[PDB]
Design a protein around this ligand. Sequence first.
Ligand SMILES: Nc1ncnc2c1ncn2[C@@H]1O[C@H](COP(=O)(O)OP(=O)(O)O)[C@@H](O)[C@H]1O
Ligand SMILES: Nc1ncnc2c1ncn2[C@@H]1O[C@H](COP(=O)(O)OP(=O)(O)O)[C@@H](O)[C@H]1O
Ligand SMILES: O=P(O)(O)OCC=C1CCCC1
Ligand SMILES: O=P(O)(O)OCC=C1CCCC1
Lengths: 241, 245
Amino acid sequence: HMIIIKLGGSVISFHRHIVEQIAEEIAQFYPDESFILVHGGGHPNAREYKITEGLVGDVDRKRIGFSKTHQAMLKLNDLIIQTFLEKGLPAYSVSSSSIFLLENKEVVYGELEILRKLLELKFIPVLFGDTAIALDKGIDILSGDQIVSYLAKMLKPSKVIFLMDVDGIYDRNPKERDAKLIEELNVEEIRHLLESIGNKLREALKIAKHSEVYFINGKVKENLGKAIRGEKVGTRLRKLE
Amino acid sequence: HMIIIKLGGSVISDFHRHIVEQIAEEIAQFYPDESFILVHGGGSFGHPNAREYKITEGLVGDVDRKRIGFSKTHQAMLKLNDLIIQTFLEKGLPAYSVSSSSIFLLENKEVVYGELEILRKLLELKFIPVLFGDTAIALDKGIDILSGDQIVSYLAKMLKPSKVIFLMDVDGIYDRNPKERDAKLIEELNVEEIRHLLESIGNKLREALKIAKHSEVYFINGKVKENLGKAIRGEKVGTRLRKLE
Ligand SMILES: Nc1ncnc2c1ncn2[C@@H]1O[C@H](COP(=O)(O)OP(=O)(O)O)[C@@H](O)[C@H]1O
Ligand SMILES: Nc1ncnc2c1ncn2[C@@H]1O[C@H](COP(=O)(O)OP(=O)(O)O)[C@@H](O)[C@H]1O
Ligand SMILES: O=P(O)(O)OCC=C1CCCC1
Ligand SMILES: O=P(O)(O)OCC=C1CCCC1
């Protein structure tokens, strides 16, 4: 009984009111429910220093920007952590680039014993999309979707909840005209959509092999509780069989 | 051919940006031909929160308040870590933060579980990882305070550095409390003297005994710049504890 919740980069950006709403919803299940939290950037230094290119060209500048981008990520992570703390929840920050190693944007080495111990002692670990050491490229950007995929394979949570700007995975483009919400997502529908973001839809296809997946609107407070309890909300991709 | 520098808690803070710039300049005199790990203690940041929430008592009594204070102490340590790293970055050195509580587990104040591959890759790619004394999960009492001395001890037995350099408020180890008007600095430390001093701080001397099995140890004054380079070059400075045999 453990639930991973991924906060998109756009729902938290700082949007303290929505973080307070997520914390109040999580408080309805703590501590009779283990929770892991992952959030994203809200990004400037990563593009400015070309982290995804790797350790090539001006390597000294890339190492400085690698650290600067990590320090910025820690500052935003602190904003989220403090908000959770004044709401009574023991959120504890875990540095992603301290426990993960990348190859081809994917985690190929991980340390998970501290996360396990944090959950066992009724803590709420909070990771973030981060800069990360890459075996193939020296340095790379580890996205939140990759952390969630690796955690899903290893810790096998009961479900993974994506908080997005829209109500879920839509038929056409969400901000279009005649777009319908896919309340029940199956794998063939996912492959239907990937031919015509697709990155997290691919990660969702991987995660579904291990856990139930929800795509919900993180701006509506009650959606998080509806997804945690299993009620109808947004888009739901059941565990594969 | 790797050096572990420990930055005493009352050296870097009680924040002294000037001496941190001094340590950065000294280190930049040897980077990148030499690889460094830095461990800094809680200055005026981590202690006022740890003793306020009594982290060393473990997960006992008001466990909910201790969990909050556990987190608040880690966040303050991360703020101090950011000041030290930003200072190192502006000096052109690629310092990178490693969260101690993300990779270590404690029991009886000692690390009994650790992850060191990310540290290894950081050193391999010419980064300077910066760890800190931190709150930590303890297998016996739930939560505890992981001292930078114990971090360096675990890193010494594991990575076997060429030397370990403690930056302190004093010139090194003395015959007694340096506050006494008659107190002399020990230039060459040995196990007999360490046991002599311990029978009457002490934690740093016990860890130094364990560390000396794998690395040569230096105790120097961290507020005098040229002292660090002297210890890195193996010159005569402060107190030296040679590798055991
Ligand atoms: N068919 C679709 N269904 C839902 N959202 C879509 C679709 N096509 C494009 N999008 C948009 O793609 C974006 C992906 O969000 P993204 O920035 O990847 O989240 P994160 O911050 O977690 O990386 C969403 O904001 C959404 O508006
Ligand atoms: N024989 C001795 N040699 C050196 N320092 C001593 C001795 N006896 C007592 N001390 C004192 O113990 C202190 C050790 O500080 P310490 O607790 O190691 O700092 P931190 O915990 O921040 O690393 C020194 O400031 C020094 O004044
Ligand atoms: O969770 P996301 O948004 O997929 O990845 C996180 C993105 C960044 C960019 C700089 C540091 C972290
Ligand atoms: O690193 P030091 O000074 O040896 O040990 C003390 C460390 C901390 C970190 C949070 C509270 C106290």
